[PDB]
Each structure stands twice: as structure tokens, then as C-alpha cells.
Design a protein around this ligand. Sequence first.
Ligand SMILES: *P(=O)(O)OC[C@H]1O[C@@H](n2cnc3c(N)ncnc32)[C@H](O)[C@@H]1O
Lengths: 76, 75, 985, 147
Amino acid sequence: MQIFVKTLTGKTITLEVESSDTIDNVKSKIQDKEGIPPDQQRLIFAGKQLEDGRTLSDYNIQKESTLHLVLRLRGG
Amino acid sequence: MQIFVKTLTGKTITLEVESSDTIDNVKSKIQDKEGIPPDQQRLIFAGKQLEDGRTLSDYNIQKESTLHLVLRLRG
Amino acid sequence: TIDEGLYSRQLYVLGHEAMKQMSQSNVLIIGCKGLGVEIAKNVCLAGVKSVTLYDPQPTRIEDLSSQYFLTEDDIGVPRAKVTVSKLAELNQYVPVSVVDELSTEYLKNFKCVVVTETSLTKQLEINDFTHKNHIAYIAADSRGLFGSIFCDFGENFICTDTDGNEPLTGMIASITDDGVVTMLEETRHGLENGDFVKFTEVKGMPGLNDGTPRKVEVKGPYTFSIGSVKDLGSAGYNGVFTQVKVPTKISFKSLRESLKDPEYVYPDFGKMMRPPQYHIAFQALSAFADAHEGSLPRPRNDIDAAEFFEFCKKIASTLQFDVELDEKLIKEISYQARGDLVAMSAFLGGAVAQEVLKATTSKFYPLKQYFYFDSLESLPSSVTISEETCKPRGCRYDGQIAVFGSEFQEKIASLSTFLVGAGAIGCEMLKNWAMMGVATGESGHISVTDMDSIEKSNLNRQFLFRPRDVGKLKSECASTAVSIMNPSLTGKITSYQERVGPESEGIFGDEFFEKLSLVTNALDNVEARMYVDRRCVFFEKPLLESGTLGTKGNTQVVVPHLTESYGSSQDPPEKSFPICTLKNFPNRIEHTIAWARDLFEGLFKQPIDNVNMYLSSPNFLETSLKTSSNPREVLENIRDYLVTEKPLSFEECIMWARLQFDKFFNNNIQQLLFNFPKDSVTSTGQPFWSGPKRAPTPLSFDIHNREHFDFIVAAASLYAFNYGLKSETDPAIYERVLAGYNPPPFAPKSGIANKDKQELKSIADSLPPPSSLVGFRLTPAEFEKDDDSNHHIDFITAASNLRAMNYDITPADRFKTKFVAGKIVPAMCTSTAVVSGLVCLELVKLVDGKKKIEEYKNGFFNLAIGLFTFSDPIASPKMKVNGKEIDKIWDRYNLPDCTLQELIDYFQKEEGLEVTMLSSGVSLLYANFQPPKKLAERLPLKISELVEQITKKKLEPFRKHLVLEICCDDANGEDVEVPFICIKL
Amino acid sequence: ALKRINRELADLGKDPPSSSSAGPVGDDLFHWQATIMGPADSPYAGGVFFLSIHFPTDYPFKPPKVNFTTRIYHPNINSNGSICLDILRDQWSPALTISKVLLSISSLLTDPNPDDPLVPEIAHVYKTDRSRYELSAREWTRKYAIG
Ligand SMILES: *P(=O)(O)OC[C@H]1O[C@@H](n2cnc3c(N)ncnc32)[C@H](O)[C@@H]1O
């Protein structure tokens, strides 16, 4: 299984994960490839915001799935 | 022979080693006794840092010598 | 020649070439209803060359549902004629015209053509012409809670910037013989496969410094590969790589071709089967309108819905669409055909205006090609929606009633909201509320708060403020403008001038917060967001957060007892560089700017503040001797800025400026190079000034040089402002006075029981007694943007550029220095409009009081790449306390004002917990490890009395509650997490 | 932040640091006065160094402000007491206790880093004349860090 993560700036990241991996492993991989601490990552799949402690199979994330890595902004 | 290693918390650990023992073996013993990964150990004796692949004798470490185990940090 | 005083924020986003191209493009707008007027407003604020409007239909009352430039006295007049007059005032550089009749050839004068509220036949007729003549064509439609956008920029559109990001750059550590480029220690290049880079300052491989871009093959987060450099050399060291952005060719298809096989853009991946439905639905809508003399289906009418569904089936069969039509959704589109909402209008107007700017400037990635959007979850479910309750009542809210109904209109009209901040997002939100009719009922009210005043650079992205309004308060101007827009709000809006913070809890107290219905933030800093969030959590009020940054934006909703608060999640913090890097070894312009800011603070505001505070505090020295780490520095500062170096004239001020120049740009460098010569080696034998460390060079003063003279003038003017002298800007005096200065000799020094203390005491007593000077004060220099034109930005720029020339760093001009030092947030009108639209779409959900967590949508979007995402809010976590389910955020203990002993026994008896730590505010009221005597003293006191005693400050009369944080552990010794306590005074 | 601060304080209480002792000032939680003993095999032997810790309002999301109070002759500490540590500026994460910071500071006292110094004069002295640096450190610690 291989997944893609798209940032809010258009960058694409390719991750190699299994269906039984926890969300913490995915966040750790994203940190390795980007340097963002796991507590600052907001992952979205099919309108659901991924939360720590659950597995990918809970969200029915299969191969070639696309996640969105987003963040909040402070302007006004 | 016997040696003593003092940590940053003031704890002293006594070890029975030999002058021909490698630094890797010492790090393995330290990991076994305390669980501290070898990468984060910084051993200092007489102002000199012990390096893996070498022996205690290379640093003129002798009977009941005292070493200091500190953390790694640069900046 | 762009007006940097008005387009200051937009220049950080687009640039100078982009705006030069933008000011040469003409835009035509067909249709002047709510969507059309929003597009025209956003375009005018953007700064296109001109805008032409065409809409000869006479005004009808229902059009006021979303058109905010029309009034009840304009019924029967063509919309363009009555809208142009108001549109002309938004920006004085953008002429707005009107055309009473259109012809095909006449379309050749415009760079972009926007079409709204037009049948399909006219769109096909126009597009068949505009496509072959290479004119960008954008078509937008807004039907109730549904919206559609179509873009066609020609057969060979050329996009110069795709993602809109700044080019990436970095420092190399080694380039092998096979193109294996390695970054420095713990540094990420951030490139991607297929990018192009160019190298500079590479040692050992000079050929790479020519500047020819090369393909990049990323092999890891720290290293990548560029190809074979065998011929160019053997190995290279150090240097800097920089990304190159290349043009792309995008090919579009005409509307007639596109209808058969559209190419969709999905705003939400949670519903990927809908856009094919809307594609059929909108064509069916157009056909039905063509079948009823342009009469749309009546609201919530079932016969018209059946006929519309038959049209949908016929169209789907005609186009061989192998899609099974979802009857419920299509009939929903049919019911809301006549709906006209201001939130959808704002959202689509922002998006389409961004598309227009893309077409004119050829930047960012356009939509390709269809964008179908819906917010159907916003449809109320707690009220009666039927043909009887949705029929028009002949009022200006007919457009909204046609979607929601009269009962929901009454629900909206009795809201009592609270808007924090009245900037750009605030103005858009206020306009939306005025159009929707918020708080126009007998029990409605609106409260706006903002402490700033209108400036000249805010007029561009804030359309409620006119150049005649410069200097007034934001809240008053916004309230008056919205009352003008909707006369029914006269007297329903209250405006304050209070900063929302710990010092304003006397005004926004329990009485103020008990009557509210929801709080909406329009702030620009995180501290205020967190504080308002804490207040909302304590009082249990719904909250609406929204933020923008250039072309990116986000919106979040906080609902009591359902979702987590704003502060339950973290955000990336501001980057802070190591002090060693900033002080001695910089290698970037930001380092020098930060150093210059620190120097300004410590040279013009720190010493003056210290001097002023010394003259007032009688015991300052007594506490300073034992408290401050380096009292000697404070004493020397006081002496130097009080007695030793008190100026009287301007020539001595210029001499002081020259002295500081020598101190900070010629002597420190000499000392540093004396300590670490240029040929010194590290402990490993490697060169010292290699890589992140750049070898400095002393700067010799030169009056003729522009940079040095600018620094001298800025420093002298700032010093005069400090000492209240008559500054001058004539170069003749500077030239006359600077030539007679002979610098004192300077030679680096090598360094080499209570005597020091006695010396410091002698220096201290040498100072004049406090009674010598009474009432004497000096003005420290504060930071602003040309409001206090003491050359603040100019001084920082000069200092940073001089230090950059010290370390051979590339200098930055005044614009970039203003951007960095001022921490300016890039702003765009389109992003503001879009976020306001999303927030107002969430507001109707909040009003209806929906309880399921799947019905809310936090939104994120980036308009540079046409990315939209929506996600359900995070549910508040639960926990187990005393074998019961407790919400970790929205639950609290309500207790009377009881004694500490009584509270401890209450927790021991009811919850079975042993109290260990108890604190309120910033004080530790009780802890288990305190000595027995202190506790025995503090046990029989009530909580209010205990807090008064510890804080040494009486509780204010308006205080009606206290918030206590308590940490207690179970009987077994395991720590237990419990919610806070709310003591009721 | 109060709960986090109290948790760190209790964790220190449960396991004594032996070579360190940090605690609040008066009855204020946002101001601590820590104490450190110099390493035995170091010129700072037999010295007691005071440190001031100011917790920001956003702790642990913002690093604590740690400043030496006594006078110490060290390459990585200037006259104002500022400390050159990566975990206080940009490597700070909401998982480091004050105990980790004190251990890091003790390690810093164990071996200075003259390759990336904060006080160039002392760094040059350390690189050139080791004995003079040793004598200066002993004199400074016996004149400022005893009592
Ligand atoms: P954009 O930054 O242009 O507009 C920001 C507006 O928010 C207001 N604001 C900032 N911080 C506060 C606090 N603490 N209280 C009330 N209002 C605030 C500014 O005044 C701008 O109007």
C-alpha cells in the first residue's frame, strides 16, 4: 500500500504504509519527510480529520488514497 | 578491574571491565544496566572523549578510574 | 509607480510585475445582481485598469436580498445605472463605465469577460466568439445553496507561477562526482521531483555557477541528485542553490466542447459523485427557464420539480451520461432555484474575482474547468419549510426566505451576536449580517469592538472606510456604513473601543456575556484568539474563528459540549534563531534585521525607559543591586544617557551617530577577527569561517556612499527625536559637520576581594540625587509605519544593510525590510471575502442549533492552486472521574464560597479524591508539600479571602466568579485529571 | 499551564535531582529559583550557581527563559547570564521537563563548546592558553560561586 499527502502549498509526499499502521506511525513518517512535529499535523481524508490512537483501516484508507495536510492561519 | 562512571544526576555506577575492552562493549553494558542508548552517551575522562572502536588503555584508563557520562549537545 | 501606501499588503502577495500587468487589463461584467456586484467590488479593490458593467434589467425588490448597493428608493431603475455611482468610490484609480447595449465585436476591447445571470444560449453565443479571439471567459451562477464556476482562458494559456510559493534556496555541504548534492547538517532542501535549480558560490566546480537550470531527482529529505557533473569537475564544497520557476502551457476547451465531456474540480473529496449531478442539474435549469419565458421554478413547488426532473432525465439521456441521477438532490436544486443568499454570493464572488486576477496576470493555477459547490448541510431542519412558509412576502428578504422560510427569518432576526475585531474580515462579516437581517427584531442586538483607527493602507481591502473617514474609529465607521446599507439596523448596533483582554473584563463581564448568542473573531494575533476562546469556554457560547494569509484561509467552529475548543490544538510557532547566530555569525538577511531590531530596542527605548524609571522609583537601585544580573550595565546606561552624554545641539547628535556607527560596524568586527582570525582552524582542523559562518570585513565610513549617509541621517533624526531637538534633512549640514571628526584610536584588547562591589557603589553614589531632577522625562522611540515618521523602517533598513555588507550578505530594500521587521501579514480582498462567506454559512447552522457533529464543517482553502477541503470538527474528549463520564473541556464544578478546609473535605467526601495542588490565576493557593504552620494558618479562610491575602490586591466589585485549577490524586496514589472549579462569589 | 508546572514540580519532588534543587519563589508559580552544583572534575568544583527560570504564559508551547544569576567564566555564557542551548530557542518541544534542562546545563558545565562560542574572548583564551583559562575559572568560581 502507498498513499499520497498533499499540503496546503501544493507539495506532494509519497508514503509507504500498511493498513494496520496506527495514525502515530503515519505522523512520524510525515515528520521524517517534512520536520513537522506530530502534534502540529492536521490530516484530512474524505472529510474526516484523522485523530491519534486509531488505525488506517478504521477510515477505510486504501492504496493510492489522498490525504490533505492542512493548518490554521493567523491573519485578519 | 573496576571503574566508576558518574552521571549528570550524581549517580555512580561501578563496573568490572578490562583495559582491552572496547568502547562498544562499555556502551553495550551501559545500555543493559541503565537503558541509555549508545548514541546519546558522551563519556569524558580527564577532559578527553572516549570513542567507539577504541580501548580504555588508549586513554590511559587505570584501576578504579572515574569517567563522566553526559548528554550530547552542540550549538 | 504602484501606490505602496495603498497596495502595501497586496504587493507582498502578487508583486510588482503582476500589478503592472494587472493595471493594463479590461474586465467586462454581464449581470449586476449580488454575485455580479461582489465580483465588481473585488475586482475594483484588486486594481484592474477598468471595469464595464452591463445590466439593463429594471430593479426589483427581491434583488435587494444580496445586492447591498441598492436601496428601496431605486425600484424601477436599471441596476447598472444605480450601482455604478456607488462602485466608483471604492477605488479612484479604476474607472467604472456602463454600456446600454452589447454587440459581439464590441467584446474585443476587454481582456476578461465575466458572465452571470444569463441563459445558456447567450453564454454559448458569447463563448463561441471569445474562444477563437483569445479572451478569458468566466461564467458564474449562484442558485440557492449551490454554485457553479466555469473558466476558459483560451487554447494556449501560459502560466508563469504555478503554486505561488517563494523559490526555495539552501546551502550545500558537498557535491560528489555523480551529482549527489548534500544539504548541511539537519537542513531540508524541500524540493520535489522535476524541479529546476541553479547554483552559486560553489567552490571546486566553477561551472555550476554559470546559472543553467538542471533537473532535480530527490533521493532524500537532505540530499538529492542533479545528474552527471563528471566533466565540470571532481568534487565541490559549500555554495547555495536556488529554485527556478518555469512557465507552463495550459490548454482549455471551449464551452460547446466542454459540455459533452467536462473536466471537474472537486472542492470536497467527501462527496465525489455529486458534481456530475450538478452538471446535469444546471443545464436542466437553463432549459426549463427557456421553456417558461425565463421564469424559474417557484420555491418548494412539486409540479415544477417534476417538470425539472423530466428535463434532467432528457438532458442526461441526450448527452449519454452513464450516471444514475440522485432524485433527492436534483429536486433539492429545483426547490431552491429562486434562492439568493449573500453568503454564497460572497463565496463565489471571491473565487471568481481570484479567477479574474489569474486571467489578467497569468499567475497561479486556474480552475480547469468546472467548479461545482454546495453547502446543502446548512438547510434548517428545526423549522417548517414548505411552499406556504417559503412564498415571497414582498420584502427585501425574499431571496433568503425563498430558501429558509419565514420562521427561520424570525429566528435570525432575534440574534444577539458579538463580533471581536472590525478589520477586513470584520467588515465583510458585518456586511453579510446586515444583508441577512441579523438582529433586526425587537430583541436583537450587535456589539462590535475594536481599538484601532483607520489608516491609509486599510482602505484598499476594507470597503466600508472611505478616504474621508481617515482617523476615526473603525467600529463607529463600520456601524454607520452598515446602518446606511440596511436602514432597519439604526439603533441595533453598539460599538465599543475596548481591547479584548485581561484589562477589559469589567465591560465584557457576566452581564454582557450572559445575553449573547455567539461570538465571532476577526483578529490577527493568536494571544487574543486564545483569550477569547477561554472566555467562550467558561461562559459556554458558540464561537466562530477565521483566518487568512495571502491566498490561504481557514475557518473553524466551536460548539459547547460538542467539539473541542480553539486552544485544544497546536500551531507552528514563530521561528527564533539561536542567540549566538544572531549576535556574531549571521548568514541571512533575517538575522541582520533581527539584530537591527534588537539594537534599536536597546539603543533608543531601553536606555530612555531605564532613565525615566530611575528618576521615579526611590528604591530602584536597592533592588537592582541584588536583582538584576548585571547592575553595572544599568548604572552605566543611566550615567551615559543622563549626565555624560546629554546633548543640546544637533551637531553633537551627528557626532554621536558617527560614534555609534564606528562602535557597531567597525570595532566589533575588528575585535571578532582578533579573537578568531580568518585563517584559524576548528578543533578538528577544518577552516573556521566556512559554511554557516561568513568571514566579516570592517566597514570604513564614506559620506558620499548612499547607505552610510542614510544611516547617519536616520540615526541623527532618531536621537534628536529622543532629545526633542529640531532635526534637519539638509545634506549640507551633515557634510559640514561630519568632516571635522577624528575618530579616537581603537586597538583590540586581549583580556588578561570585594573591590568590584566598592567600585560599583562608588559609581552609583556618583550619580545625582533623585531630588536633583524632578518631573524630567525623555521620550523613547516607539515603532510604527510612517505614523511617527522618525525613520524607524529606514533606520532598521540602514542598520541591516550595513551589517549585511559587513558579512557580505545580500542586502534587502526598504519594502522587504518593512515586511520582515514589521511582521506584516499579507492580505488579499478575495481571501477575506471567501472566509467571510464560509463563516456566514456556518452561522445559519449555529442559529438552527444542530447537535450532530457530522453537520459542521471546518473549512480550509488555498486559492493559488484551487484547493478546498472541509473536515468535521474534533469531538471533545471524554474521561472517567469517580466512575462517571466527564467532558474534559466543557464541564466544571459549581461550588459556593466555602472555606479551604470545607472544599478539601467536600472533594474527599463526594468525589473520593485527595487534593494535592490548588491554584487560581497565577498564585499557588494550596499545595500538599507546604509546611504545616502555613497551612494551619491558611485553612480556616474562605477562598475569596485567601486569594485576596495571597495576591495582596482586593477583588474588584464587578468580579462575580473565580476559576480554580485543581490537581488531585486518587486514593491509590494515581494522579487524576479533573475539570476546573467555578467558585461563585 | 499551571497543571503542567505543578506536574513538573511534583515529579522533581518525588525523585530528588541530588545535584539540583528547583522551586518557586514566594507563592508565585511563574518564577523559579534553581540551584546547580559544579561538576567535581571541573574548574567549577565546590561552587553553587543560582538560575532564574521564567515560564511564559504559553508554557509548554513556548520555551522557559533560563538565565544564570551568578558570575561564571564560561565560553557559552555571557555576562547577562544568557545560555547557549538549542532546546531553549527552536528545538523546544512540549515534552521536555525542567529536569532535562538542568541536566543539559550540567552537561554544558562539564564540557564547553568553543567551536560555536557566545563570548569570543573566552573562547580564544580556551583555545590558546588552557592553563590561564583554568586559573581564571577557579578564581571566578571561588570569588563568585561560593557562599
Ligand atoms: P487585520 O489585522 O487587518 O485586522 C485585525 C483587527 O483586529 C483587531 N484586534 C487585534 N487584536 C485585538 C484585541 N486584542 N482586541 C480587539 N481587537 C483586536 C485590530 O484592531 C484590527 O481591527
